Amino acid sequence: AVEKLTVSGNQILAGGENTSFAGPSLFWSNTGWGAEKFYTAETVAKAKTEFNATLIRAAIGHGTSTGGSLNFDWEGNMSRLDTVVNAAIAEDMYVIIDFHSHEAHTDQATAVRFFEDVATKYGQYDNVIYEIYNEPLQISWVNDIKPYAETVIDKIRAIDPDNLIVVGTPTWSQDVDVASQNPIDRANIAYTLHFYAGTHGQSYRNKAQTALDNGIALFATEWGTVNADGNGGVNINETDAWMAFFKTNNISHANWALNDKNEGASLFTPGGSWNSLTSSGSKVKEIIQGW
Amino acid sequence: AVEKLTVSGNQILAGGENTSFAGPSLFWSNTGWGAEKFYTAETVAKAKTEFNATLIRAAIGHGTSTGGSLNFDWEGNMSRLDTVVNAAIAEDMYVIIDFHSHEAHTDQATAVRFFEDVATKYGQYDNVIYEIYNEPLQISWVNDIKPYAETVIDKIRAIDPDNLIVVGTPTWSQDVDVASQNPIDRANIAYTLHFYAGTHGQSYRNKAQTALDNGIALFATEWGTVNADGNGGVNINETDAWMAFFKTNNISHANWALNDKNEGASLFTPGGSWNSLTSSGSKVKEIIQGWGG
Numbered sequence: 398a399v400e401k402l403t404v405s406g407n408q409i410l411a412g413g414e415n416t417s418f419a420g421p422s423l424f425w426s427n428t429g430w431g432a433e434k435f436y437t438a439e440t441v442a443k444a445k446t447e448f449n450a451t452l453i454r455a456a457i458g459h460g461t462s463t464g465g466s467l468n469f470d471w472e473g474n475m476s477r478l479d480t481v482v483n484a485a486i487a488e489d490m491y492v493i494i495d496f497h498s499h500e501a502h503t504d505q506a507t508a509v510r511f512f513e514d515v516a517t518k519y520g521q522y523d524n525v526i527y528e529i530y531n532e533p534l535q536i537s538w539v540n541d542i543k544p545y546a547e548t549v550i551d552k553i554r555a556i557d558p559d560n561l562i563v564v565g566t567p568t569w570s571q572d573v574d575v576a577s578q579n580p581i582d583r584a585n586i587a588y589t590l591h592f593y594a595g596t597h598g599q600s601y602r603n604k605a606q607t608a609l610d611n612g613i614a615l616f617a618t619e620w621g622t623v624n625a626d627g628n629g630g631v632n633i634n635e636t637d638a639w640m641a642f643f644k645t646n647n648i649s650h651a652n653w654a655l656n657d658k659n660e661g662a663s664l665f666t667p668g669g670s671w672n673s674l675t676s677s678g679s680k681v682k683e684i685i686q687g688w
Numbered sequence: 689a690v691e692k693l694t695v696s697g698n699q700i701l702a703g704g705e706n707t708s709f710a711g712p713s714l715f716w717s718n719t720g721w722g723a724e725k726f727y728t729a730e731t732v733a734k735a736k737t738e739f740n741a742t743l744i745r746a747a748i749g750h751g752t753s754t755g756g757s758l759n760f761d762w763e764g765n766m767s768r769l770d771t772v773v774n775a776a777i778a779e780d781m782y783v784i785i786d787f788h789s790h791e792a793h794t795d796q797a798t799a800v801r802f803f804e805d806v807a808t809k810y811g812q813y814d815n816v817i818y819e820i821y822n823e824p825l826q827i828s829w830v831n832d833i834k835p836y837a838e839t840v841i842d843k844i845r846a847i848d849p850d851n852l853i854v855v856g857t858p859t860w861s862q863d864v865d866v867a868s869q870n871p872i873d874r875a876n877i878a879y880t881l882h883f884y885a886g887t888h889g890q891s892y893r894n895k896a897q898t899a900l901d902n903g904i905a906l907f908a909t910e911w912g913t914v915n916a917d918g919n920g921g922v923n924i925n926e927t928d929a930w931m932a933f934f935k936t937n938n939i940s941h942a943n944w945a946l947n948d949k950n951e952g953a954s955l956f957t958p959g960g961s962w963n964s965l966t967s968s969g970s971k972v973k974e975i976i977q978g979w980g981g
């Protein structure tokens with residue numbers, strides 16, 4: 398079993414203690430996107446045996462115009478999620494159930510369906526973390542994200558009252574500072590912080606520091622060692638700066654992405670696996686093993 | 689009236705004869721979960737006229753941290769159970785009173801309260817079948833489930849001495865083979881077997897075969913035609929394989945679930961009922977209608 402997660406001030410506690418966890422985020426679960434082969438019990442086990450990962454994020458794709466997402470293949474995506482969640486539980490790892498969307502607030506009925514479903518099927522497990530809105534775009538925290546979050550949090554809690562729920566923030570989950578000015582009034586809520594080392598520097602970390610200073614807990618559910626588009630070279634200086642920042646603030650994180658697509662963010666070289674890591678994968682392996 | 693259910697060897701006898709019954713299992717009775725609307729006398733009557741169902745399972749939600757369960761709304765869940773039980777008696781159908789939990793052994797005070805109340809109110813009826821622990825998880829049969837079971841069975845039996853009590857087994861009630869190695873020394877006790885056609889096949893039937901061969905009777909109080917992930921299509925051939933295994937061994941069963949949630953296991957389409965069945969609903973209706981009721 399894993400320790401239950403709760404929020405106290407700007408800290409997420411595990412079994413009542415200050416600590417943090419590191420693991421990989423699976424790539425989009427979308428049918429046709431190539432990462433389906435990774436949504437397996439075998440891969441979840443490998444994340445643990447190879448990197449000593451303590452968590453794994455299931456990025457269940459959502460989007461009314463996003464091919465192969467929940468809007469086009471509910472069954473396939475939900476089946477992949479089920480496989481990963483059950484494996485995570487069996488491996489004593491946390492599983493971040495991510496409604497991987499950039500438009501959750503405009504397709505609310507689908508979001509509610511997704512969350513009532515996951516809360517019903519997996520809510521009893523302390524391993525389960527709900528990530529209700531991956532990456533909101535340049536929208537309003539108070540008027541777009543917050544109302545949607547309150548609605549979804551309440552729908553989830555009518556089924557599963559105990560849990561840590563991580564809420565996306567404006568501008569691809571960078572504006573944790575804006576969210577911190579008007580936090581959500583519900584128990585155990587953390588806020589999403591996303592960054593890509595080759596694009597987001599100190600100024601982005603400053604925004605995260607502001608959020609922590611304002612009293613909200615952060616969870617970096619997705620981050621890359623490369624550029625913001627998921628490609629390019631590994632920026633060690635910025636990656637190390639960000640990891641140091643996370644370590645000294647007990648911020649848990651999931652790296653993008655356990656996949657083999659021909660892009661720098663992939664942990665594996667194209668058609669490769671755990672024995673053929675990319676430059677990003679090699680760095681991520683050390684970070685996770687050393688966490 | 690319905691025949692008295694007893695256990696002899698690995699067989700459940702009705703009035704002393706070998707036979708089995710089939711019917712639908714209602715979804716979680718929980719307040720706010722959308723299935724409360726199905727816990728009605730009309731639904732029980734319709735399960736009989738539409739599907740020829742001879743039983744109906746009332747899945748009364750339980751969970752200290754399970755929203756809308758008996759722990760949060762005692763009266764609401766109990767009232768729904770009451771409506772279904774009385775209708776079952778009025779329709780000459782068996783009613784499986786299911787303490788729908790994944791944690792009964794860790795909240796025994798609630799389990800005892802629930803069972804003493806139900807045994808006191810409905811124990812006089814032979815229609816009543818007690819299912820004391822829906823689905824134990826990764827726990828011990830000998831160290832966790834069995835002690836819990838003996839305690840609850842004794843609490844029930846002190847009030848209602850005649851009835852069939854079905855006990856959950858490890859790993860979502862799949863480990864009947866494990867339970868068969870150390871059976872409970874109480875009269876008329878059957879053991880729970882749960883499976884989903886799209887996920888569990890011959891290896892799971894083999895575990896059940898091990899249990900039967902070891903001397904214990906089984907009752908498949910919950911089963912689905914689809915994948916265990918609740919979604920997906922109906923696996924016709926595997927469902928038939930399981931139904932043949934049940935028919936030949938006279939194992940009674942309740943299908944999951946008489947509900948309208950948009951998932952493969954629901955018998956009905958969203959906002960639908962008896963005249964608007966899902967692919968699973970059509971298959972389940974076929975099985976129940978031709979079972980023997």
Ligand SMILES: OC[C@H]1O[C@@H](O[C@H]2[C@H](O)[C@@H](O)[C@H](O)O[C@@H]2CO)[C@H](O)[C@@H](O)[C@@H]1O
Nearest residue numbers: 429430431626627628653654658660662
């Ligand atoms: O290859 C599948 C799909 O990828 C899309 O880009 C991804 C990118 O690979 C991933 O790293 C990032 O996190 O998300 C984007 C999608 O927003 C690409 O845009 C699609 O054409 C392609 O089919």
